[PDB]
Design a protein around this ligand. Sequence first.
Ligand SMILES: Nc1ncnc2c1ncn2[C@@H]1O[C@H](CSCC[C@H](N)C(=O)O)[C@@H](O)[C@H]1O
Length: 307
Amino acid sequence: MIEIKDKQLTGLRFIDLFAGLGGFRLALESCGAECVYSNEWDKYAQEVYEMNFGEKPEGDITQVNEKTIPDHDILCAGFLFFDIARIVREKKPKVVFMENVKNFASHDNGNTLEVVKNTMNELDYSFHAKVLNALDYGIPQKRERIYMICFRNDLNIQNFQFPKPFELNTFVKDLLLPDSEVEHLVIDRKDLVMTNQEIEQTTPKTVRLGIVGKGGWGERIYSTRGIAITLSAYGGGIFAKTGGYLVNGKTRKLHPRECARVMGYPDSYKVHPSTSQAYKQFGNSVVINVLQYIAYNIGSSLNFKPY
Ligand SMILES: Nc1ncnc2c1ncn2[C@@H]1O[C@H](CSCC[C@H](N)C(=O)O)[C@@H](O)[C@H]1O
């Protein structure tokens, strides 16, 4: 996670739609924005959030009244979407910050997106979309999520600019817990196949040192000198969720706390005790660092009011 000095968001207040773990809250808040709402039905989700944010993210949005959402300047939802609009039409915030999965743009040959986008314009908001790999922002991980920044045209914001990518210098190897602490994470497997051999120095691209089993989903081991592959919250394999990583001879899955650091979360974040869950949580959450950037530049555009 990044420590942002200029709270280019101090004023504005946002709601955490589809809360999750508060990836967005973490972010904007750094930017100084204030969180007025949050909703999330997942019990263990509602659990962690509250653990680190002292509130139970209001239940299932589907039945929640948009005439109930507080007034905000940013609605963050990394998802039904029709609830957003539903709300985004009622509470018409200034900026509507969203983010989703890589394939969101392409899906159904652009339907999903043609819909959403147009559901924004027919809703009166500029639509900005672009995909960024966490790795491209001081984050060691092959993650590709979509980021949609929408502006209520009234603001006439013709200058927002997604963050400019930058080489990184922090790899998985860097975010691991003192082996002693990851011992219960090993998995002695006789059927290991070293499709490849260890690497010198480091590199940003996900080094698949070797697979296990039919070597498919959650059936691969990556080095620690590469970048943690896409954490999944629904994966199935022997090295699911996090995947397996060649950590000193023995091969082990990544630790929840490790997941975090690799998700951009700060270490202070109280992660859910249901390791199974946490994983799923992180598999579903967002890369903070990136969020922080986009956030910044979001406020940084709102703040450029000349004469
Ligand atoms: N109808 C609904 N009501 C409330 N929460 C819902 C919902 N449908 C899905 N969700 C929740 O919305 C989230 C979409 S995943 C969102 C990522 C989140 N921003 C993060 O920081 O982790 C999941 O937590 C999912 O359980």
